[PDB]
Design a binder for this molecule. Structure first.
Ligand SMILES: Nc1nc2c([nH]c(=O)n2[C@H]2C[C@H](O)[C@@H](COP(=O)(O)OP(=O)(O)OP(=O)(O)O)O2)c(=O)[nH]1
Ligand SMILES: [Ca+2]
Ligand SMILES: [Ca+2]
Ligand code: NA
Ligand code: NA
Length: 326
DNA sequence: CCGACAGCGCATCAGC
DNA sequence: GCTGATGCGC
DNA sequence: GTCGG
């Protein structure tokens, strides 16, 4: 991490713009700059050097100059000393509490972990579970545990219907040695873009994983997306494993490649790739890549038989999952 | 100078 | 109950 | 906050 100090600074600024200022585009701008700097293979010596990189503008170059000179940024030093900003920033670390709910809570005088813990009845379901596992959700998951979790999920799915295919995506698929949480793409031949020949396809899998005490809590659930909590089983006299976040996404089977492209990420990589897509006259989502007509309206879905086919349309050389960690 | 910035699932709520 | 906006999440 | 046109 040649430029750890700079990228940390930019990420902190991004988080401020998202959580406090509620300026989503400034947030994305800061994260884009951080990402491009993170991959730059030289230790940055100046703002001018950084300003050569796409996403790094005049304002950021100036901040980089301040940071390199003094080891800090006055702007951030202040934000840190602001009570309302500090509190809002903290509260948003709970899953289910966003910028709006955080500011609302601060208004009501709820601004610490202790405050939340004695005001559970003021939280919705998602927030209450977010609070419950606040500490656990802070922890990362060693790849070794991710592998054990993979085994459990794939084996339990197979026991429901051997025609299910479950794929672990996210940072795990990108080869990371540790992951923030588990993401599972699910397909079944009964669910395609042309028909749903069977109901409760996602439900049956969730139920099974709850049955073996793998899924422990539910944050939200619909016909195609599950968001919840899971936990590896522990051995005799062993301390329990931390509870982990799990997301499961049921995708039409004939749209697997667009699905897996999306679910593999990273998030910044996806934003960059979809952005480039627009520049190139296409629109990409987790289902399809379509041409944009002169009207601006998306045309019909183009044939896709691989992740590479999607890269081909937008004239990008294929990049393996491990090189999508932006 | 300024329009545009990726795209979408589920939960919650106001209005009807 | 439905629909569209909003919040929050991926 | 940055960028393309
Ligand atoms: N968190 C997040 N994920 C997004 C966004 N947009 C988008 O396409 N995704 C996709 C790509 C991500 O790799 C995928 C899974 O989300 P994730 O938060 O679990 O991220 P991850 O596996 O890459 O990283 P991590 O768990 O190790 O922290 O969702 C977004 O705005 N936020
Ligand atoms: Ca993940
Ligand atoms: Ca996730
Ligand atoms: Na630049
Ligand atoms: Na949050």
């Amino acid at each position: 991490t040649l430029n750890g100090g700079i990228t940390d600074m930019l990420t902190e600024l991004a988080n401020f713009e998202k959580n406090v200022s509620q300026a989503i585009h400034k947030y994305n701008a800061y994260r884009k700059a951080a990402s491009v700097i993170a991959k730059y293979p030289h230790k940055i010596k100046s703002g001018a050097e950084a300003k050569k990189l796409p996403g790094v503008g005049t304002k950021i170059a100036e901040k980089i100059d301040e940071f390199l000179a003094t080891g800090k940024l006055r702007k951030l030093e202040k934000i840190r000393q602001d009570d309302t900003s500090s509190s809002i920033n903290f509260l948003t670390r709970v899953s289910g509490i966003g910028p709006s709910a955080a500011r609302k809570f601060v208004d009501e005088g709820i601004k610490t972990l202790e405050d939340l813990r004695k005001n559970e009845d003021k939280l919705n379901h998602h927030q209450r579970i977010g609070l419950k596992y606040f500490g656990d959700f802070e922890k990362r998951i060693p790849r070794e545990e991710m592998l054990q979790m993979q085994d459990i999920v794939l084996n339990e799915v197979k026991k429901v219907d051997s025609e299910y295919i479950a794929t672990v995506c996210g940072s795990f698929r990108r080869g990371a040695e540790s992951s923030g949480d588990m993401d599972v793409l699910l397909t079944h031949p009964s669910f395609t873009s042309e028909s749903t020949k069977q109901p409760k396809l996602l439900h049956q899998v969730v139920e099974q994983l709850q049955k073996v005490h793998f899924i422990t809590d539910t944050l939200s659930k619909g016909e195609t997306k599950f968001m919840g909590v899971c936990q590896l089983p522990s051995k005799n006299d062993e301390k329990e494993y931390p509870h982990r976040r799990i997301d499961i996404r049921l995708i039409p089977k004939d749209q697997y490649y667009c699905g897996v492209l999306y679910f593999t990420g990273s998030d910044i990589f996806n934003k960059n790739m979809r952005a480039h897509a627009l520049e190139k006259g296409f629109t990409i989502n987790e289902y399809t890549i379509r041409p944009l007509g002169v009207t601006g309206v998306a045309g019909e879905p183009l044939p896709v038989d691989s992740e590479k086919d999607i890269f081909d349309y937008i004239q990008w050389k294929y990049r393996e999952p491990k090189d999508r960690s932006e």
